[model samples]
Target: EKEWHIVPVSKDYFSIPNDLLWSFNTTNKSINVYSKCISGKAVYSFNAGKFMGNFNVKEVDGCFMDAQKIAIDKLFSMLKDGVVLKGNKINDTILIEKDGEVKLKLIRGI
Candidate 1:
């Protein structure tokens, strides 16, 4: 069976509203997406490089559902619906938000 993979090409840091008492490592060069309801922990850690690779989902163990939802949510919050989302045999690129009214184009090797 063919596998699928997901990558986080960009990330933005936001101050927790009123320091909701959660903490996790954010310096790993990889992005960890977590539920706001989780206390003091990250839900998942994903490597941007792995997602960019042309491997199937089984090979990379990519978060097919959760990551996609988080990514789309972040993108929509920052960009218009017309933003381009691209994937290729060798890599994938996603245009995402870095901050309010600021966007970043990121490329990853598959």
Candidate 2:
């Protein structure tokens, strides 16, 4: 018989942007918001999922209201700039574009 040793990898290697605004719940889970000017008449808004948690676009839409609803399956595809995820255990950033303009950016938290 042979013995083998296993090493654990730390899941702490991401950062979020500073210009984005964030808010956290009582559980310390937070979401970042990113904004961009559009057509000089409208502003586009984007939001990130909670950090360190199993957050999906479906979960976000369930909590907030907007013109369109986002789904979990579309998370990766919908990423942009200025969107961030912050929490006690995880942090990450998202960069997004809308209407041919840079709309959002994101980073992870430690």
Candidate 3:
């Protein structure tokens, strides 16, 4: 059997968008976040797989750097809360959390 190892993810592994709408899709093997911003005409995505779980920019239509940061911070928070394992798997079955578009600004200062 292979030994279990926790690979430390560096900052180099990993944003925001206008008219932002963020929805997190959590599954057993990975976490895929989708954002239907730009009036839902141009969708973007962010993800982390079940191997040393580091955030990655999955898709980009245009300017979504600000929105990406939101997803990363939020997803990382879930990890700290023990909702996700070091390997990037979820604690339970699949689920999705949706948030409507917001005009207000949100940021995590850590």
State every prediction's TM-score relative to the real structure.
0.22, 0.21, 0.22
Write down the worst ten-residue block by lDDT for model 3.
1-10
Model 2 reaches what TM-score against the true structure? 0.21
lDDT of 2 by residue, 1-110 (tens): 11111111111111221222333333533333332210111123334532222222213324332322222122324332323322234433343334344333333332
Q: Local distance difference test, per candidate?
A: 0.32, 0.28, 0.32
| Per-residue accuracy of model 1 over 1-110 as CA lDDT, tens digit each | 11122333345323211212212233643322223332222223234421221111111134234654455444434332233333456644444433333244444321
Give the TM-score (vs. native) of candidate 3. Answer: 0.22
Give per-residue lDDT, candidate 3, residue 15.
32
Stretches of candidate 2 off by over 4 Å are: 1-20, 23-91
Q: Who is ahead in lDDT, 1 or 2?
A: 1
lDDT for residue 1 in candidate 1, whole number 0-100: 12
Q: Number of clashing residue pairs in every model?
A: 7, 22, 11
